[PDB]
Scaffold this motif. Structure first.
Motif, PDB file in Angstrom:
ATOM      1  N   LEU A   1      16.268  50.290  25.886  1.00  0.00           N
ATOM      2  CA  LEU A   1      15.225  49.648  26.849  1.00  0.00           C
ATOM      3  C   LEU A   1      13.699  50.428  26.749  1.00  0.00           C
ATOM      4  O   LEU A   1      12.690  49.591  26.453  1.00  0.00           O
ATOM      5  CB  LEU A   1      15.725  49.667  28.359  1.00  0.00           C
ATOM      6  CG  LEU A   1      14.776  48.664  29.046  1.00  0.00           C
ATOM      7  CD1 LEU A   1      15.749  47.971  30.368  1.00  0.00           C
ATOM      8  CD2 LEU A   1      13.598  49.686  29.935  1.00  0.00           C
TER       9      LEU A   1
ATOM     10  N   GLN B   1      12.465  49.110  22.906  1.00  0.00           N
ATOM     11  CA  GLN B   1      12.326  47.719  22.760  1.00  0.00           C
ATOM     12  C   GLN B   1      12.183  46.686  23.918  1.00  0.00           C
ATOM     13  O   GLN B   1      11.806  45.653  23.865  1.00  0.00           O
ATOM     14  CB  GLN B   1      13.559  47.064  21.873  1.00  0.00           C
ATOM     15  CG  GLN B   1      13.449  47.810  20.489  1.00  0.00           C
ATOM     16  CD  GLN B   1      14.501  47.154  19.598  1.00  0.00           C
ATOM     17  OE1 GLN B   1      15.649  46.769  20.329  1.00  0.00           O
ATOM     18  NE2 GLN B   1      14.279  46.777  18.337  1.00  0.00           N
ATOM     19  N   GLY B   2      12.268  47.245  25.193  1.00  0.00           N
ATOM     20  CA  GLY B   2      12.121  46.425  26.391  1.00  0.00           C
ATOM     21  C   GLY B   2      10.844  46.910  27.066  1.00  0.00           C
ATOM     22  O   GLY B   2      10.005  47.239  26.578  1.00  0.00           O
ATOM     23  N   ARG B   3      11.020  46.777  28.505  1.00  0.00           N
ATOM     24  CA  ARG B   3       9.853  47.338  29.443  1.00  0.00           C
ATOM     25  C   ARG B   3       9.200  48.822  28.930  1.00  0.00           C
ATOM     26  O   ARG B   3      10.086  49.668  28.695  1.00  0.00           O
ATOM     27  CB  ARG B   3      10.389  47.332  30.654  1.00  0.00           C
ATOM     28  CG  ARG B   3      10.723  46.003  31.459  1.00  0.00           C
ATOM     29  CD  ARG B   3      11.806  46.009  32.869  1.00  0.00           C
ATOM     30  NE  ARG B   3      12.071  44.831  33.019  1.00  0.00           N
ATOM     31  CZ  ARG B   3      11.554  43.771  33.760  1.00  0.00           C
ATOM     32  NH1 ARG B   3      10.179  43.899  34.393  1.00  0.00           N
ATOM     33  NH2 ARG B   3      12.201  42.661  33.986  1.00  0.00           N
TER      34      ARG B   3
END
Ligand SMILES: O=C[C@H](O)[C@@H](O)[C@H](O)[C@H](O)COP(=O)(O)O
Ligand SMILES: O=C[C@H](O)[C@@H](O)[C@H](O)[C@H](O)COP(=O)(O)O
Ligand SMILES: [Cl-]
Lengths: 566, 558
Positions: free
Chosen positions: A403, A406-408
């Motif tokens: 995460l 590649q996320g938040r």
């Protein structure tokens, strides 16, 4: 406002307008480009003469942005706040208390610190001397259990600030060469939750005759702690077949409430006190931590821990703003949270020893700065304190780093150490296990900053179908902190660094980092539910129990609970 | 895609209506609250009344799930379709706990259940024999310690279940005299901690790695092997009796020196973060607690699977929980969820959920590679209650809004009731469980504070805005069965959110970059330890920042 300690609210500060523009400028620039500037990178490293190395180059700042941040710290009068803290002014204004965790580790002979006319260092050192003597005697067997056995086990009863810091430090030192020897043969269980399972866990493998109970509570009224203390008391009474005379040799206390400790049956020669100006989440350098740590490891290890926290204190109160590591980490986090809107911070110690460091930092940060009004009671138009969480590396890389990459966006704080507490280097192995560990510490921040673009993926020959899935946008900020080794001294330095950084952020925002009014409502409502449950267990009907005044949801689930438990 | 669904537009308007209303007013509506409760016949009670929804909103949420084909996806999962398209893999953790005699489930023309049950039978027999002493260490001592080596998915779920069962009356009896250490970190302090207090002659090592090539786990396995070789005076022949493995890579396990009768496999269609109901979890749990405890755990997961597979959308607990989470995260913008079990036994449950949730849904592209226009997976964290109340609830109450999920149990594993005491210790714990959600929903206004005599000076400081949402989940007791139900509930809820968003919940490409770069730093470090100068080591290619900090590190550790 009028007489407020730092009256220019953040939005009124001269540099706030300037910093809003920087944010607009810096959000267009990728870290991969900013990091091409070595002159810039080089001026975003700080390295103290007692071993603390901080690199904050992987942040969305130019040297210009940093100058604005420093100016903002001045506009907010953060250096003046530091002096008020250290001289013992009652800056915890909503409770009218001083904020003097720093006094706990000032050495004897330090300049007096006065609170209501008394030099508080006198009582600080009187308690430390008593812990030293007491820990020495328990450890040697000069003081024994009721049946004459050496006390080799400790049940330390306490919740929140009364254990999280201590458990952090305990585990940090457990594998340390010298500390381990001193702790040999000795055990400590932390009894925290009112869940009676935690009582069973704390008791497991402990013979009451060889066990010392430490009851730790500032107020000596915390519901969970006192319930636990009475339950452990009952365990001794079962062991000793009802003989109350057997209890005194197995019990001691740490509190600010001597009426409470006495009523509970612990006399003053077994109470090791502290003071109202020690916040729970700032209490590990008081008797709260020093007693159990001294019992486990000996007073010398506990003293070195105090000296390290003191070293970092001296730095905080004497380093120029731009060279002041706590100021700097405070400014960077306010920049990420308030200006860039990043709500979370990942605390990532590359040390199994620091397994419970993130858990302690979570209270310290969230309970200090999770507020919605200024010191003087004005509603803030924006969210302040960040959500802190974490696990040690490399563990976390296989848990939530997906995460973070590649996320938040989650600004990260990597903490590492140059030397291992328990080095291994196998003959056939290319690198030592510590170096393998640290290969990750050095690689992760660059991965977060630089990323990997579709272009690079193509050149690598990734098929086009998988390119988006394997893209790494980068531009994700991080700080790297690196210490020589996991000694008591460096554990103290790291602790104090975070203690002060939390303070810095609170002062930047104008909030009170030192109160916690937000925990009260839960306690009051749970006391009401306690009463309702009692009545139902006594056989009163729902109309008779007081539950009819609660909302329908709670009515139904309580009833389900009572029915499934009866 | 999500924005193209009819109900998305509708839910965007619901959000505007709902942000003007306060839970303190919504919760006055008893007919409403009553329809925001579900209660299964295997004992799982879910209350989602403290959410910023009307019954209209909920209908819209249910419709969005149909529009996104969430029910068709369940069917694809259960039938073994390769719904992890980026890796071309089935996603068949539910197969792991299908009982003997369930209908076949095919991948590549083969009923995977034949292999699932063959490994389970072999774990039963192997664990029985270790626990009884029919299989001994190399010197003939009964094996009473386990060092389970594994990182990420290969231990977090297992440590969750292990601690959840440790104090259970019957499991504790079965675990008596037995110890298990989890060796996860490549930090050699964790090796020292794993080995501590264990005599190698009474210790079994389980090496757990899906690939059997993970850097940390293999170095750990090699380091523990070395510890065994030193104990046994370099005698290779002694190692076989002290090692076994769980992996999909049998070439790797053989090459490590573990023969197939000490390898308990799993499959490519078992994600790491969904692996605890495979050999990954079942072997060490069976070793510690005996197979029966592991089976009951499997039976509980399976009960919740059947629920997920059969319950109508509006009655379906994982779907409901996933929908509510997307409502909070995606529509209301709340980035975090606090996982708050009122159970010391569930000390490491948040940590497992943290991986399951964030590694699954921490993504930025859809299944077919379109860039998402918004953030998806939430940031999950937590500690057990009541501990957390004295740590971070201050913020959850007065600072940033964080949707919360309270988990509790009706009975204690270790009940205490003191004579002198008004309530039992469990009831005291539970008083907090019942109180906190209502504290969050209703808060306490300035007006009420004035009525209670709070000076006007402190009123702002002691104000609680409320309106903060929560779910309450209550199970009967912390049995292996209910632990299984709780686990599978969360596995399916994470899958639901993924499908709502259109992402792949089941890959994790996000971890590769750190691994490749760490391998390069490893080589640089080797060269520096071997005496190559800074300009000869490969360092020159790294950013200045890293070059400096690496040289500091070498200086300070020379
Ligand atoms: O900063 C501490 C907070 O006031 C609170 O969260 C506290 O740490 C614990 O509740 C323990 O309280 P006692 O020490 O009073 O038992
Ligand atoms: O779902 C899990 C992810 O793939 C990853 O977190 C994995 O769990 C670990 O990296 C260990 O993988 P091995 O089992 O291959 O060692
Ligand atoms: Cl800090």
């Amino acid at each position: 406002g009028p007489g407020s300690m730092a009256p220019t609210q953040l939005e009124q500060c001269a540099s706030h307008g300037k910093l809003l523009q920087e944010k607009k400028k810096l959000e267009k620039l990728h870290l991969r480009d900013l990091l091409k500037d070595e002159a810039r990178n080089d001026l975003l490293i700080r390295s103290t003469d007692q071993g603390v190395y901080l690199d904050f180059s992987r942040q969305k700042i130019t040297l210009e942005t940093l100058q604005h941040l420093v100016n903002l710290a001045h506009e907010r009068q953060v250096p003046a706040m530091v002096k008020r803290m250290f001289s013992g002014e009652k800056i915890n204004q909503t409770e009218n208390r001083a904020v003097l965790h720093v006094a706990l580790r000032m050495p004897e002979g330090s300049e007096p610190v006065h609170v209501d006319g008394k030099n508080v260092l006198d009582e600080v050192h009187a308690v430390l001397r008593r812990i030293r003597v007491f820990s020495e005697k328990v450890r040697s067997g000069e003081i024994r259990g009721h049946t004459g056995k050496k006390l080799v086990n400790v049940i330390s009863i306490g919740i929140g600030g009364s254990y999280l810091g201590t458990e952090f430090v305990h585990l940090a030192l457990a594998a340390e060469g010298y500390a381990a020897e001193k702790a040999h043969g000795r055990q400590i269980h932390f009894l925290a939750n009112v869940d009676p399972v935690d009582v069973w866990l704390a008791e497991r493998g402990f013979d009451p005759e060889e066990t010392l109970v430490v009851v730790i509570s500032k107020t000596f009224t915390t519901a969970e702690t006192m319930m636990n203390a009475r339950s452990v008391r009952d365990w001794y009474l079962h062991h000793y077949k009802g003989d109350e005379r057997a209890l005194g040799a197995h019990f001691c206390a740490v509190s600010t409430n001597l009426d409470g400790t006495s009523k509970f049956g612990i006399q003053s020669d077994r109470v090791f006190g502290f003071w109202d100006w020690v916040g729970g989440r700032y209490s590990v350098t008081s008797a709260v931590g020093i007693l159990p740590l001294a019992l486990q490891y000996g007073y010398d290890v506990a003293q070195e821990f105090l000296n390290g926290a003191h070293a970092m204190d001296v730095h905080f109160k004497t380093a120029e703003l731009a060279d002041n590591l706590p100021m700097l980490m405070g400014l960077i986090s306010v920049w990420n949270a308030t200006f860039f809107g990043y709500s979370n911070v990942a605390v990532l110690p590359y040390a199994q020893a620091l397994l419970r460091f993130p858990a302690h930092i979570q209270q310290l940060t969230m309970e200090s700065n999770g507020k919605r009004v200024t010191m003087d009671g004005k509603t803030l138009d924006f969210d302040v304190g960040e959500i802190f969480f974490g696990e040690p590396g490399t563990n976390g890389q296989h848990s939530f780093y997906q995460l973070i990459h590649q996320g938040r966006v989650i600004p990260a704080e990597f903490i590492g150490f140059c030397k291992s507490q328990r080095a291994i280097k196998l003959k056939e192995e290319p690198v030592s296990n510590h170096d393998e560990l640290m290969s990750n510490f050095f690689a992760q921040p660059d991965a977060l900053a630089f990323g990997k673009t579709p272009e690079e993926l193509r050149k690598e020959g990734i098929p086009e179908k998988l390119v988006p899935h394997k893209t790494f946008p980068g531009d994700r900020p991080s700080c790297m902190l690196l210490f020589p080794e996991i000694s008591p001294f460096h554990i103290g330095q790291l602790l104090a660094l975070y203690e002060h950084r939390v303070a810095v952020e609170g002062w930047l925002w104008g909030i009170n980092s030192f109160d916690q009014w937000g925990v009260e409502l839960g306690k009051v409502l749970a006391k009401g539910v306690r009463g309702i449950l009692q009545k139902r267990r006594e056989g009163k009907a729902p109309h008779e129990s007081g539950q009819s005044e609660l909302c329908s949801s709670t009515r139904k689930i309580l009833e389900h609970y009572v029915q499934q438990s009866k």
